[PDB]
Amino acid sequence: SMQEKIMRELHVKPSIDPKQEIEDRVNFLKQYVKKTGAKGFVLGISGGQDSTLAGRLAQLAVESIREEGGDAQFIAVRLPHGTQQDEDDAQLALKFIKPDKSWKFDIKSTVSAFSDQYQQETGDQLTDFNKGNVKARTRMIAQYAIGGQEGLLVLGTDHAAEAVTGFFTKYGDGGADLLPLTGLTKRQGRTLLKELGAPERLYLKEPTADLLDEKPQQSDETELGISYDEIDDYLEGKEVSAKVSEALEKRYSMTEHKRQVPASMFDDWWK
Amino acid sequence: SMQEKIMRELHVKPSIDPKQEIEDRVNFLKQYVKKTGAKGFVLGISGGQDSTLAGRLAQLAVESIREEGGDAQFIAVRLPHGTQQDEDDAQLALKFIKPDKSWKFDIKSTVSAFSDQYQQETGDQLTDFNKGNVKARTRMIAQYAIGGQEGLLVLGTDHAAEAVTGFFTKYGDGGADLLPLTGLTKRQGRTLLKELGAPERLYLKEPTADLLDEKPQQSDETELGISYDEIDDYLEGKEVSAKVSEALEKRYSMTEHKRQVPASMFDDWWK
Ligand SMILES: [Mg+2]
Ligand SMILES: [Mg+2]
Ligand SMILES: [Mg+2]
Ligand SMILES: [Mg+2]
Incomplete structure (x- = not known):
């Protein structure tokens, strides 16, 4: 079935051993950064579940590399656009992660300069939806600048429940070097x-991309019209409604471009 | 040989028919539009050879779609960082391409905001090389904002002689939706x-990324330490000197990450 194909494409297991998944994903981070010769990792810490998880795995990997006599560091970076409404949850995430380094880059001045230029050049206001993707891409630029300056790889937080819906900005938070949560x-x-x-406050925190000025902290599920528990059932191979399977198989086909390198005429996946 | 392997991987012919290549690449642009229900394209026009060629192909494609009774448009966009030294060649390119729409977005104020923020936050000035990659990624954001506002796809200009060396910014000019020049x-x-x-000026001038403030209009060959004739001989299957194969095969391996989606533990290419 299409559910099985998608499950397999996205690397989803029906059941997991949480401790061994942590070990395996820490080990992937160590293997990849040692293979490449990079000095460690950078990651934007939003206060949300996925970056809290990826951040802690990164910090465990660099601690293990130093325990072996290697040189590795993890830079966690706060990337608010001006005042972040859930800053307290991001600060809670940093207290949990205990990153080697805790950096901050406020993207508001960059995003405002871009938006102001956009209206100057075109005569058109950049709309909230497009400006939200500007913010996500500006966060990518900030993480790659830190990484370029410090010799680090940029972690991404994509995982199967965001992959299957294409619920990320293409070349924004989708732009990363390696993915511990795949x-x-x-x-x-x-x-x-x-x-x-x-703590519960972090692992049960409502998912949000928090990109819009008009609807700050808008829940992912409001935008999707589908809950994460339904997504998760689909991806783990449980039975879901026809409405759920239909809507996710259509969104998966519609967003394949985000899960492939740019399309050329030699590619067969888009046909 | 590894030469033959890289030729296959990058889709390169020793031998082409120029009229057929044009037909095939225009037909790809039209097919991708028809399949996806897309409304046209946006592309940065630099005054260099690659964006000249991709831009004219894009304009031929949208003219052919409209001749067939469809709806498509092409927006060409100038993306100077303040005063571009070869603006005249970009204007010559526009005059040849004859795009439906020719827009402009000066990226300087955005790049200066970012760079000033970076130094305020870190106490470090971005290297000229890291700031040049900020410029290339800011150009990606500009094209995606125009595309997002207007409902268009972003063309990229990657081709085999840039792919083999990885001579593009990751999620900068590498970040695109479809590639007519592969x-x-x-x-x-x-x-x-x-x-x-x-016009011959646009293909006789030296290729340049022109990203650096201190070394403006630096020729690609100066940065690479290898000429395009050498790259092209390699890629076309011609007998080349061992020094060229050594240099290119090392760059190709080192930059594989730029030609794959972000790495996960379920990928083996990197190990
Ligand atoms: Mg997330
Ligand atoms: Mg979030
Ligand atoms: Mg080029
Ligand atoms: Mg150029």
Whole structure:
């Protein structure tokens, strides 16, 4: 079935061993950064589940590399656009993660300069939806600047429940070097974060991209019209309604371009 | 050989028919539009060879879609960082391409905001090289904002002679939706421009990324330490000197990450 194909493409297991998934994903981070010769990792810490989880895995990987006599560091970076409404949850995430370094880059001045230029050149106001993707891409630029300056790889937080819906900005938070959370459903991520000892406030925090000025902290599920638990059931191979399977198989086909390198006439996936 | 392998991977011919190449690449643009229900394209026009060629192909594609009773448009966009030294060549390119719409977005104020913020937050000035990658990624954001506002796809200008060296910014000019130039060597791109009747200045000038404030209009070959004739000979299957194969095969391996989606533990290419 199409559910099985998608499950397999996205690397989703029906059941997991949380402790061994943590070990395997820490080990992937160590293997990849050692293979490449990079000095460690950078990651934007939003206060949300996925970056809290990826951040803690990164910090565990660099601690293990130093325990072996290697040189590795993790830079966590706060990337508010001006005042972030849930700053307290991001600060809670930093207290849990205990990153080597805690940096901050406020993207508001960059985003405002871009938006103001846009209206100057075109005569058109940049709309809230397009400005939200500007913010996500400006966060990518900030993380790659830190990484370029410091010799680090940029972590991404994509996982199967965001992959299957294409619920990320293309070349924004989709732009990253390596992905420790690939294959995890939303609830499986949550299980890892709880096993790592995070408080409920972090592992049960409502998912949000928080990109819009007109509707700050808008829930992902409001935008999707589908819950993460339904997504997660689909991806783990449980039975879902026809409405759920139909809507997710259409969104998956519609967003394949975000899960492939740019299309050329030699590619067969878009045909 | 690894030469033959890289030729296959990058889709390169030793031998092409220029009229057929143009037909195929225009037909790809039209097919991708028809399949996806897309409304046209946006592309940064630099005054260099590659964006000249991709831009004229895009304009031929949208003219053919409209001749067939469809709806499509092409927005060409100038993306100077303040005063661009070869603005005249970009204007010559626009005059040849004859785009439906020619827009402009000066990226300087955005890049200066970002760079001033970086130094305020970190106490470090961005290297000229890191700031040049900020410029390339800001150009990606500009094209995606125009595309997002207007309902268009973003063209990229990657081709085999840039792909083999990884000579593009990751999620900068590498970040695009579809690629009309895939598989072309540099001299093959020149041959297609000659068939389309381009002004010779645009294919005789030196290739340049022109990203650096301190070394403006730096030639690609100065940065690479290898010429386009050498790259093209390699890619076209011609017997080359061992020094060229050594240099290119090392760059190709080192930059594989730029030609794959972000790495996960379920990928083996990187190990
Ligand atoms: Mg997320
Ligand atoms: Mg979030
Ligand atoms: Mg080029
Ligand atoms: Mg150029």
